[PDB]
RNA sequence: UGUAAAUA
């Protein structure tokens, strides 16, 4: 039941209310949208004794607030402004309940806030992260849990995350096409050890042809091209070779092709470009097709940018006559710029 | 001229 004090506050009868006046009422106010915003605001100016007064009360109902639409922000504010003993005490209230919280709309924010707020070497977060063991795939696919999984990878020591890696065994193809999985895979590639990522990268290479044309998979492949080891870059490039023209005209894979052109060796780059500028297969100039394609024109620009002088001259000579052509097409109207300021 | 997730 709504106390008179909260009713009175919601009616603006206490225009200069001070945190101290909420003794006994902290939990009630935290579950109220306006009272919660009030407590959030005052915690940022509150003295330490005042924070502690509020803390003593929030600790008593911590789990309840953590899953509350408005109270979860009060909990988060102590992960922001509390001392370590306070944070650890609150995290103690998460422990035992990590899985349900991680799947809960509000609880999942609390968990991420703790992970960002408490040093990874503290026994808690260790205990907290292990609670996800046996539930990793369910969390990864969940709209709330997938952020919790990403935050663990971002904040915790990679060695303790071996269970996540094992969880992904044989699932890297499927999860890379997944709206959240692809994000989880990318955090793994950024944060885990070369030993842990070995099996991930293996499965990525196995399905590169399929992943470069996927709405989410294309991002995972680009990530390896931008941040991976050269030997993995080289593997992805070998899958593109022979398929430049087709993949260049593809909404998703066109992007992968650009990254291949950028991140390949000079030798590899030259062979990719050769496939476009200096070959003959059909009554059409591969370059002509690409120039004015909505997606491929971007690939052509990267090639012009990255080409050796020789290959660039040929690309320019083969575009030169098609000025009027380009004119009509929207997409040729950056290629034309480079042409004019080259001749 | 072109693609990326859950609170008041």
Curated annotation (Swiss-Prot):
This is Pumilio homolog 2. The gene is PUM2. Transmembrane segments: none annotated. Pumilio repeats lie at residues 21-56, 57-92, 93-130, 131-166, 167-202, 203-238, 239-274, 278-317. It is found in: Cytoplasm; Cytoplasmic granule; Cytoplasm, Perinuclear region. It comes from Homo sapiens. Expressed in male germ cells of adult testis (at protein level). Highly expressed in testis and ovary. Predominantly expressed in stem cells and germ cells. Expressed at lower level in brain, heart, kidney, liver, muscle, placenta, intestine and stomach Expressed in cerebellum, corpus callosum, caudate nucleus, hippocampus, medulla oblongata and putamen. Expressed in all fetal tissues tested. The chain holds residues 706 to 1048 of 1066 of the full protein. Homodimer; homodimerizes in vitro. Interacts with DAZ1, DAZL and NANOS1 via its pumilio repeats. Interacts with NANOS3. Interacts with SNAPIN. Recruits the CCR4-POP2-NOT deadenylase leading to translational inhibition and mRNA degradation. Interacts with DDX20. In case of viral infection, interacts with DHX58. Interacts with TRIM71 (via NHL repeats) in an RNA-dependent manner. Sequence-specific RNA-binding protein that acts as a post-transcriptional repressor by binding the 3'-UTR of mRNA targets. Binds to an RNA consensus sequence, the Pumilio Response Element (PRE), 5'-UGUANAUA-3', that is related to the Nanos Response Element (NRE) (, PubMed:21397187). Mediates post-transcriptional repression of transcripts via different mechanisms: acts via direct recruitment of the CCR4-POP2-NOT deadenylase leading to translational inhibition and mRNA degradation. Also mediates deadenylation-independent repression by promoting accessibility of miRNAs. Residues 254-258 are annotated as: Guanine-nucleotide binding in RNA target. Residues 72-76, 218-222, 297-301 are annotated as: Uracil-nucleotide binding in RNA target. Residues 146-150 are annotated as: Non-specific-nucleotide binding in RNA target.
């Amino acid at each position: 039941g709504r106390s008179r004090l909260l009713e009175d506050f919601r009616n603006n009868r206490f225009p200069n209310l001070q945190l101290r006046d909420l003794i006994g009422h902290i939990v009630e106010f935290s579950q109220d949208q306006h009272g919660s915003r009030f407590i959030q605001q005052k915690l940022e100016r509150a003295t330490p004794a005042e924070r502690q007064m509020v803390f003593n009360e929030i600790l008593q109902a911590a789990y309840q607030l953590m899953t509350d639409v408005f109270g979860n922000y009060v909990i988060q504010k102590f992960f922001e402004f509390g001392s370590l003993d306070q944070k650890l005490a609150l995290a103690t209230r998460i422990r035992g309940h990590v899985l349900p919280l991680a799947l809960q709309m509000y609880g999942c924010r609390v968990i991420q806030k703790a992970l960002e707020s408490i040093s990874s070497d503290q026994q808690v977060i260790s205990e907290m992260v292990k609670e996800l063991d046996g539930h990793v795939l369910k969390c990864v696919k969940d709209q709330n849990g997938n952020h919790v999984v990403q935050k663990c990878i971002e904040c915790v020591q990679p060695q303790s995350l071996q269970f996540i890696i094992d969880a992904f065994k044989g699932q890297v193809f499927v999860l890379s096409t997944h709206p959240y999985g692809c994000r989880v895979i990318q955090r793994i590639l950024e944060h885990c050890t070369a030993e842990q990522t070995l099996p991930i990268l293996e499965e990525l290479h196995q399905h590169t042809e399929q992943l470069v044309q996927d709405q989410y998979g294309n991002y995972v492949i680009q990530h390896v091209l931008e941040h991976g080891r050269p030997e993995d870059k080289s593997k992805i490039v070998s899958e593109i070779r022979g398929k430049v023209l087709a993949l260049s005209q593809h909404k998703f894979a066109s992007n992968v092709v650009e990254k291949c052109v950028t991140h390949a060796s000079r030798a590899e780059r030259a062979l990719l470009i050769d496939e476009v500028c200096c070959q003959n297969d059909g009554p059409h100039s591969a370059l002509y097709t690409m120039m004015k394609d909505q997606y491929a024109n971007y690939v052509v620009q990267k090639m012009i940018d990255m080409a050796e002088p020789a290959q660039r001259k040929i690309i320019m000579h083969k575009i030169r006559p098609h000025i009027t052509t380009l004119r009509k097409y929207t997409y040729g109207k950056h290629i034309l710029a480079k042409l004019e300021k080259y001749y």
